[PDB]
Design a protein around this ligand. Structure first.
Ligand SMILES: Cc1cc2nc3c(=O)[nH]c(=O)nc-3n(C[C@H](O)[C@H](O)[C@H](O)COP(=O)(O)OP(=O)(O)OC[C@H]3O[C@@H](n4cnc5c(N)ncnc54)[C@H](O)[C@@H]3O)c2cc1C
Ligand SMILES: Cc1cc2nc3c(=O)[nH]c(=O)nc-3n(C[C@H](O)[C@H](O)[C@H](O)COP(=O)(O)OP(=O)(O)OC[C@H]3O[C@@H](n4cnc5c(N)ncnc54)[C@H](O)[C@@H]3O)c2cc1C
Ligand code: SF4
Ligand code: SF4
Ligand code: SF4
Ligand code: SF4
Lengths: 642, 149, 642, 149
């Protein structure tokens, strides 16, 4: 709910336009965006190319890493800098198995062979990595390393700023739509946005555009609907902006049905990675049963995915869901037994690990430490409740939803290159348009280091694309003006109809952003496998969801906004609605349940490797208002065995 | 969500920018030109990331846990420096915990993005190598990955 | 969420007190309260007794019947005025079976033998009852008759006003606590309240007090959490006030674990009674399966309840819960097929029943008609989705939660008289304190007519009590002053701590009513068998609920309020929190699942007639802050067999 | 929830009391003493009971379905008289339905609570009989119910 202190209204024709011409435009200054800005600045010199970074907030703390992070979740270690060395083949296997068999191995292997270099640079730039007395990076699990990352984003932000220059970074500018080449219907030409600090419409003209807006949250009703609706596990700052503008431009989406349901400390959603992997904490149900044991047999039907190590996250979630459905809650993270076991009676050792435990929270999800403080929970004395949050859509973490992107020429098989007009690393099906981090689908487990890395990869590819193809996109001035009118329409609608009621938020001719969002969340929660149905859905529910989303979409044409802040909220809602529609259509298309634990199609309860071991890709045609789906069979690209 | 302490807030004296308004990733912190004091304009959209809290030069911003699940009384107070950050965690029951963690091993603003890197070349632009590679990877050569036979 | 336009603050010391002396004080001017005022006015004349009715809103439309009702749910018909006559024994059997074997038959038979007279008076006063061409009241099902009841409450309000006199009715006065006899810890002496229209504290001194506040809603998080949090199926106006003040006084509660889960039209919660019983509508899952039939086998285990006709409502609920758990939603009410089959090809007949269908909604739950209008749903063309709402606590409808009250001398067996110091009809265990309508437990299915009737019964009993016992309790002035200070404490707390933050609603030293309510709703939803767990709970979850409610109760001492409206909201929250605690403690005490469909104890999934065929009665001792429970075995009072 | 049309509301300044404020069962309707116009002060607590709508002498109040589940465009408008009530249901798609139902068969304010009833007596006070019984029940004798042997 939003109650503005005062009005801040503007009519489109009263707002000045600022035109910015650049070569490479990066939308989103988070981890992937900063990686792209950093790398782009390096190669751009070859053509004296201009690189521009646009961020809706402030790069110093914007995005998922605003609080910092307690670990770097992706570090292969090909030389032995950490406590455990790994191979690229094992990593690729790991990711494909976690995806229950569906991952673009050309893309995963690609970021994997580059990620360690990125991590090494991070340390070079000042990031303190936990080290053993011998100087080795401290491992959390097999693929992550612990870090003192409270300032993780500010450090990465400084690197990006130093590389591209502050004069090339636009902050507090919300991008709401892409612009296509007047000369080519399947080529990008820039993007439009508006400032949230003053009345100013932005028109960015570019030869290459890179989507780095992060994923999408608040599509689904959370487990807390009051103030805590703000405590989303994934970044509340990411609202599916890249998904919206990219899909509207005609860029194909992939695996958009693949949401991620995070099992974390209840309510605060504090991290469990260190507790499980580092502190060796056990999770038990209300009766003291360690369900990863009692529910192990139930995974036998998922051969050979259920035999993988570690066990695929969705299957781990599935075990949790079975406990929840059986009514065995609360589920507890027994931190008290974990700390006692690790300390071994050594009081000084206990103090040390105790400090490590709190840093794991204070370095990335302070709310959990605050929750413990408010509820008088001392982890050395009593266990904490854990629970799965509502669904989130992103492609950098454990979820792989995002755009279908091209891979490196030396790894991408012919089977995966068919839909790309131009073969450039991380380019979408739309010429000149790239997608990275959460925006790039089918290659998850990138996390902070991998996302920054994918950004670097796309940036170099963007410079290569520009110097080789030599594009010269022309924006359509008529479309730009149309978009400018649409941009501020909500403010004009508020002014035009507010007089119908004595209350600004109860009007029959318009809906405010928070009102449309409440509606979106209820629809998705009840029909799209949200928490309301313990992540279950079927054809009928999904079809009803499309019907309700249709009404909502029509009502977006009657959105109102009272100030610039709410105008951004209005467009963030628009972005989420289309993201939600794509998600529902993807879930409706795939007739199987491959990721039990993330969602269940009760009408197709089994995993089908005979007919569905494929990536589901879709394209939305704005002109015809039609969605087209395609199945791209998975092919093993990298050598590995179960 | 975050909230501003009126007694400590000075609406950011004569500095060039309002710290909290400048840093908030969700555009929640803003100034009440009348009081010349800041406030969170939409608390149910607060991620409780503590960015505003850390950047307020007057330490006038605190966080009061979301009412949905937070009993009154708890608090986490950071004192961020240049190389480390201190935290004080106060429990509803009076318990007080103090911690201090490193945050950076080098001086702020000292990053040299491509330090030691060779200049880019058109030839290199066509390879799979990113800036600094394969040297920064630490391996004896660019990492190779076995393709499925 | 509440955002007052401006402050309306007062300190206790500056608020004037108005003392009102009366003989009979009726708290709540809803259906049961109006029945009490009506009947009390008749007998009071025998002793020149003064009768006072206090209502927090305006009697003309206050309470559950604010929109009107489409039927009178309880009309036995002992002479043939309706389409179907019934006997009292059959009715008693019907109620006991619906309660899965547990009902105070002395109380049920008692209101039943009186209810028809009440209905007849209602018609005499102007209520239009649907009639056949032959002049018979139109039956909905076996026990209900259809009415043109848009003005049902205004008519009843007029009768009460004419009987007791306008000068004896206090409106816009919120009662928040009872007063006890200074010289008898188990005798009532009056009550305290405050105006919500001006700064005025009320002290009512009475010899007999009748609790008629209606039940409790908004204890549990609803299926809609935005504006629609206001669309509770049961009366949002009833917040468990009677339960709170009565339990605080030491009056024993009974069957408080017995919540009611209403299965109604989805979201709007329009009625299904007429559709099912009158229009012969069928309910089917997403695959066209009529589950009352496909799930018939699942009810065979309940003996003899599962073989009863009609099937007990909780068991009917159970069948749909099974469908929901299997993921066979949406659940549909096939109004289109019901209308087509009833009309039989006769277009004029169709128009007639079509109008009847809309009246069923427009006479009591306009929101459902509005929902249909907004979603373009024409009942003659397409079916509507249905769903069970969150739990509600009341004793007049299908739920039997309320105070343990005394029955009539001619029907109440000695087994049920043990806990009553004085044997007056409808008197609680606290001398001089009566409970009616939703406030009287263990005798459900009263509905509108039955509640008004129970009020009449208690009123006559109160007059008899006063003339026979000549009660003369004395209020404790010290306690009154303490209560006056407590009454306005929230306003004083707001003024004292508002300066700690630049935002009135984000303060570390207080919680506003809406904030405390969001918290209460989340606790109950997640741990007390709310919608979050498909109405399932266990010992561990219930125990955690008590721990969280303890934190909340402590925080109630730090409640703040910005105006009189919010001060009432503050106390309405206080009332709900204690009601919620009582509910949790009752569910925790009963180690069985007697009403599957209403709630399931996963740790005690079976119905236990060997050790749990008893009423669960509790007492809260405020001085010791202790709860005590006891089991009162059920005994069949009325002659009937299965 | 309910909302007031500014053009139609005159703040009941030509009557002895404010109708909407007086009637609302949840104390939501109040006056903005600045505009002298009513408004719903807490819409998420509105039951959409239509009491305010029906009692506004200026027909200035309407109901806009809860945003959580209501697409824009629908409306239910009552015109309440003395013996009946008229309703117009307007669909989002433009469809319009009209209904009219009876609401009372006697004049308003005409109830004589104890019409025809004998005077109460001390003797009767000790019986199970309520005012007007047993005849108001329709029987010459008080209904009997068989007690279980
Ligand atoms: C709670 C949590 C725990 C995590 N734990 C770990 C961990 O321990 N270790 C690890 O390595 N990784 C972890 N990650 C993952 C990591 O943070 C991501 O993988 C990474 O940030 C993804 O980068 P991004 O660039 O895709 O998204 P982000 O970093 O979120 O960046 C997106 C940017 O786009 C901006 N933006 C959005 N829309 C628009 C628009 N319309 N116009 C302009 N700008 C816009 C945002 O403001 C933000 O600056 C975690 C994330 C969260 C949220
Ligand atoms: C949606 C719905 C459908 C129903 N359908 C049917 C039907 O079709 N037919 C039928 O016969 N029955 C039906 N009923 C049931 C019927 O309405 C009740 O049984 C009856 O109203 C209960 O009466 P009561 O006096 O206990 O509570 P109510 O009638 O709700 O009265 C309670 C009074 O107490 C007041 N009050 C509360 N707290 C305080 C306080 N602290 N201080 C002062 N006053 C206070 C309230 O403002 C209200 O005026 C239905 C109810 C609802 C809500
Ligand atoms: S940064 Fe601190 S001092 Fe400055 S405006 Fe914000 S709260 Fe006030
Ligand atoms: S805690 Fe973070 S999200 Fe909340 S107001 Fe501060 S900076 Fe913004
Ligand atoms: S009853 Fe109608 S005219 Fe009177 S104040 Fe309310 S809305 Fe305005
Ligand atoms: S619709 Fe009913 S609850 Fe809502 S404001 Fe009007 S009278 Fe009050």
């Amino acid at each position: 709910v939003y109650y503005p202190k005062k009005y801040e209204l503007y009519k489109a024709d009263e707002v000045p336009t600022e035109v910015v011409e650049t070569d490479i435009l990066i939308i989103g200054g988070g981890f992937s965006g900063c990686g792209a800005a950093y790398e782009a600045a390096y190669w751009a010199k070859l053509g004296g190319l201009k690189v521009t970074l646009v961020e809706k907030a402030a790069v110093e703390r914007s995005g998922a890493v605003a609080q910092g992070l307690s670990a770097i979740n992706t570090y292969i270690d090909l030389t032995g800098r950490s406590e455990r060395q790994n191979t690229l083949e094992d990593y690729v296997r790991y990711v494909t198995l976690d995806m229950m068999g569906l991952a673009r191995e050309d893309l995963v292997a690609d970021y994997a062979r580059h990620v360690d270099g990125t991590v090494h640079l991070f340390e070079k730039w000042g990031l303190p990595i936990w080290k053993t007395p011998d100087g080795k990076y401290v491992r959390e699990g097999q693929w992550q390393i612990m870090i003192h990352g409270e300032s993780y984003k500010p450090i990465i932000a400084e690197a990006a700023k130093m590389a591209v220059g502050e004069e090339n970074i636009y902050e507090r500018v919300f991008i709401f739509e892409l612009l296509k080449d007047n000369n080519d219907p399947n080529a990008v030409a820039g993007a439009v946005g508006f400032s949230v600090r003053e009345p100013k419409f932005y028109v960015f003209k570019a030869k290459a555009v890179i989507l780095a807006t992060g994923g999408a949250t608040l599509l689904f009703r959370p487990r807390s609907t009051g103030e805590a609706a703000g405590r989303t596990w994934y970044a509340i700052f990411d609202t599916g902006s890249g998904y919206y503008m990219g899909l509207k431009a005609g860029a194909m989406l992939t695996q958009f049905e693949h949401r991620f349901i995070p099992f974390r400390f209840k309510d605060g959603y504090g991290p469990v990675g260190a507790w499980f992997l580092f502190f060796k904490c056990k999770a038990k149900n209300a009766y003291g049963e360690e369900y990863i044991k009692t529910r192990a047999a139930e995974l036998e039907k998922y051969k050979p995915y259920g035999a993988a190590q570690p066990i695929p996250t969705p299957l781990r979630n599935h075990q949790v869901m079975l406990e929840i459905m059986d009514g065995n809650q609360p589920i507890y993270m027994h931190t008290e037994e974990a700390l006692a076991e690790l300390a071994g009676g050594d009081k000084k050792k206990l103090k040390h690990i105790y400090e490590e435990a709190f840093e794991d929270f204070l370095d990335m999800t302070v709310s959990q430490a605050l929750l413990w403080a408010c509820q008088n929970i001392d982890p050395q004395e009593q266990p904490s409740e854990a629970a799965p949050a509502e669904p989130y859509i992103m492609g950098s973490h454990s979820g792989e939803a995002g755009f279908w992107v091209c891979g490196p020429e030396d790894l991408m098989p012919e089977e995966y290159a068919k839909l790309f007009p131009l073969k450039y690393n991380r380019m979408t099906t739309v010429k000149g348009l790239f997608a990275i981090g959460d925006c790039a689908g089918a290659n998850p487990h990138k996390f902070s280091s991998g996302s920054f890395t994918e950004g670097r990869i796309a940036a170099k590819a963007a410079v290569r694309f520009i110097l080789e193809q030599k594009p010269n996109p022309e924006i359509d001035d008529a479309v730009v003006e149309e978009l400018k009118k649409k941009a501020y329409a909500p403010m004009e609608r508020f002014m035009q109809y507010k007089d119908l009621s004595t209350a600004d938020d109860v009007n029959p001719e318009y809906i405010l952003p928070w009102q449309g969002l409440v509606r979106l969340q209820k629809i998705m929660d009840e029909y799209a496998a949200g928490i309301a149905t313990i992540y279950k859905t079927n054809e009928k529910m999904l079809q009803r969801a499309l019907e309700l989303l249709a009404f909502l979409k029509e009502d977006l044409e009657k959105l109102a906004a009272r100030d610039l802040h709410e105008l951004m909220r209005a467009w963030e809602l628009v972005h989420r609605v289309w993201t939600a529609e794509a998600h529902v259509r993807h879930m409706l298309f795939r007739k199987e349940t491959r990721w039990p634990g993330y969602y269940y199609r009760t009408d197709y309860p089994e995993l089908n490797d005979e007919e569905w071991k494929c990536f589901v890709c879709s394209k939305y045609d704005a002109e015809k208002d039609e969605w087209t789906f395609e199945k791209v069979p998975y092919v093993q690209v990298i050598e590995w065995s179960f | 969500p975050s909230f501003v302490n009126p007694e400590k807030c000075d609406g950011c004296k004569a500095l060039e920018r309002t710290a909290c308004e400048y840093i908030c990733p969700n555009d929640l912190m803003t100034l009440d030109k009348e009081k010349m004091k800041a406030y969170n304009r939409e608390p149910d959209m607060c991620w409780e990331c503590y960015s505003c809290v850390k950047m307020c030069p007057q330490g006038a911003i605190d966080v009061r846990g979301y009412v949905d699940y937070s009993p009154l009384g708890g608090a986490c107070v950071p004192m961020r420096g240049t190389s480390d950050i201190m935290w004080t965690v106060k429990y509803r029951n009076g318990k007080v915990l103090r911690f201090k963690f490193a945050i950076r091993t080098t001086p702020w603003g000292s990053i040299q993005p491509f330090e030691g890197f060779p200049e880019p070349t058109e030839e290199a632009l066509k390879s799979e190598l990113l800036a600094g590679e394969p040297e920064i990877i630490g391996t004896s050569e660019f990492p190779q990955v076995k393709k499925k036979a």
